[PDB]
Design an enzyme around this catalytic site. Structure first.
Site, PDB file in Angstrom:
ATOM      1  N   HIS A  92       0.844  -1.195   0.000  1.00  0.00           N
ATOM      2  CA  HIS A  92       0.000   0.000   0.000  1.00  0.00           C
ATOM      3  C   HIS A  92       0.884   1.252   0.000  1.00  0.00           C
ATOM      4  O   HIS A  92       2.105   1.136   0.005  1.00  0.00           O
ATOM      5  CB  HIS A  92      -0.993   0.004   1.181  1.00  0.00           C
ATOM      6  CG  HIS A  92      -0.316   0.004   2.522  1.00  0.00           C
ATOM      7  ND1 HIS A  92      -0.091  -1.163   3.133  1.00  0.00           N
ATOM      8  CD2 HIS A  92       0.268   0.999   3.339  1.00  0.00           C
ATOM      9  CE1 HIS A  92       0.606  -0.973   4.285  1.00  0.00           C
ATOM     10  NE2 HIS A  92       0.831   0.363   4.411  1.00  0.00           N
ATOM     11  N   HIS A  94       1.151   5.718   1.217  1.00  0.00           N
ATOM     12  CA  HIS A  94       0.743   6.826   2.083  1.00  0.00           C
ATOM     13  C   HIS A  94       1.156   8.037   1.232  1.00  0.00           C
ATOM     14  O   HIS A  94       2.227   8.011   0.617  1.00  0.00           O
ATOM     15  CB  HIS A  94       1.530   6.832   3.392  1.00  0.00           C
ATOM     16  CG  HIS A  94       1.300   5.583   4.216  1.00  0.00           C
ATOM     17  ND1 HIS A  94       0.301   5.573   5.098  1.00  0.00           N
ATOM     18  CD2 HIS A  94       1.860   4.291   4.238  1.00  0.00           C
ATOM     19  CE1 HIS A  94       0.189   4.348   5.681  1.00  0.00           C
ATOM     20  NE2 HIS A  94       1.151   3.557   5.150  1.00  0.00           N
ATOM     21  N   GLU A 104       5.920   8.697   5.543  1.00  0.00           N
ATOM     22  CA  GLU A 104       5.813   8.533   6.984  1.00  0.00           C
ATOM     23  C   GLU A 104       7.205   8.684   7.589  1.00  0.00           C
ATOM     24  O   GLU A 104       7.412   9.428   8.550  1.00  0.00           O
ATOM     25  CB  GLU A 104       5.179   7.180   7.299  1.00  0.00           C
ATOM     26  CG  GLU A 104       3.801   7.043   6.654  1.00  0.00           C
ATOM     27  CD  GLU A 104       2.875   6.133   7.410  1.00  0.00           C
ATOM     28  OE1 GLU A 104       3.192   4.939   7.549  1.00  0.00           O
ATOM     29  OE2 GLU A 104       1.811   6.607   7.836  1.00  0.00           O
ATOM     30  N   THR A 196       2.196   1.345  11.207  1.00  0.00           N
ATOM     31  CA  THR A 196       1.937   2.764  11.312  1.00  0.00           C
ATOM     32  C   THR A 196       0.454   3.071  11.413  1.00  0.00           C
ATOM     33  O   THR A 196       0.051   4.238  11.478  1.00  0.00           O
ATOM     34  CB  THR A 196       2.588   3.517  10.168  1.00  0.00           C
ATOM     35  OG1 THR A 196       2.165   2.937   8.933  1.00  0.00           O
ATOM     36  CG2 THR A 196       4.111   3.403  10.262  1.00  0.00           C
TER      37      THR A 196
HETATM   38 ZN   LIG Z   1       1.810   1.710   5.621  1.00  0.00          ZN
END
Ligand SMILES: [Zn+2]
EC number: 4.2.1.1
Length: 258
Positions: A92, A94, A104, A196
């Site tokens: 995935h 972010h 992140e 996260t």
């Molecule tokens: Zn992640």
């Protein structure tokens, strides 16, 4: 209500339902390259994605997941700081509302446009749900995305986003090759951390690559058109689905290069 990234259910409120949020090995963190210790005893990374088998892509209301067939040792990660074989189960991203935020992890306080997470679980535990309950349970390969030239290998993903615009949607996503998202160097930083996102379990061995991959403004722009909300509900664009850096505490970051 349910956790999210908005001011009322954002990262700064997670601790109320998930006390582990204020734990001792939370992710992500800021990687200070000057204090990261070059560890010469680190083995090179072994990525075996040649027999990977992608099944589906889903909008879960936080981000979208491309899921793989982890019933056999098809796509695995070994070597590096790891002990054992880790199977790729999903990946995935972010991303931010703008190009100067989205990742992140940060390098010397620098934020990237997005961050890719390739999630793998230690085959020793039989299944993913058991693995998340162990300190060495998961291995996540993080890759930074910077805005520049197009990443050809990411187009298949970008193409299919319109079909999973809202929360809960999913589409058949077979024959995708994750090797196309890899930069040419496999140099990395490694430290023990957590997921996260809730439940924020501290079962992850992070492997953040030094070299980021470039994607075009157009490619990134399409990520930004996804929706957090469900179909028929008021449109809330999927942006800034990233968690701010957490204190490193009793942890040292090791590098595989000097
Ligand atoms: Zn992640």
């Amino acid at each position: 209500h349910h956790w999210g990234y908005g001011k009322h259910n954002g990262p700064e409120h997670w601790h109320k339902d998930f006390p582990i949020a204020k734990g001792e090995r939370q992710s992500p963190v800021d990687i200070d390259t000057h204090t990261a210790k070059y560890d010469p005893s680190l083995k090179p990374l072994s990525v075996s994605y040649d027999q990977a088998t992608s099944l589906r892509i889903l909008n879960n209301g936080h981000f979208f997941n491309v899921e793989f067939d982890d019933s056999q040792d098809k796509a695995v990660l070994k070597g590096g700081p790891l002990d054992g074989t880790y199977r790729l189960i999903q990946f995935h991203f972010h991303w931010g509302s703008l190009d100067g935020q989205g990742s992140e992890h940060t390098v010397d306080k620098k934020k990237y446009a997005a961050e890719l997470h390739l999630v793998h679980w230690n085959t020793k535990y039989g299944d993913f749900g058991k693995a998340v309950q162990q300190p060495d349970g998961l291995a996540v390969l993080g890759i930074f995305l910077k805005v520049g030239s197009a990443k050809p290998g990411l187009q298949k993903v970008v193409d299919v986003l319109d079909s999973i615009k809202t929360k809960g949607k999913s589409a058949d996503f077979t024959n995708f090759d994750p090797r196309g998202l890899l930069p040419e160097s496999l140099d990395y930083w490694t430290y023990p951390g957590s997921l996260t996102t809730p439940p924020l379990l501290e079962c992850v061995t992070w492997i953040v690559l030094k070299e980021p991959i470039s994607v075009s403004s157009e490619q990134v722009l399409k990520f930004r058109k996804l929706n957090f909300n469900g179909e028929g509900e008021p449109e809330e664009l999927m942006v800034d689905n990233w968690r701010p850096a957490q204190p490193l505490k009793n942890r040292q970051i090791k590098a595989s290069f000097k």
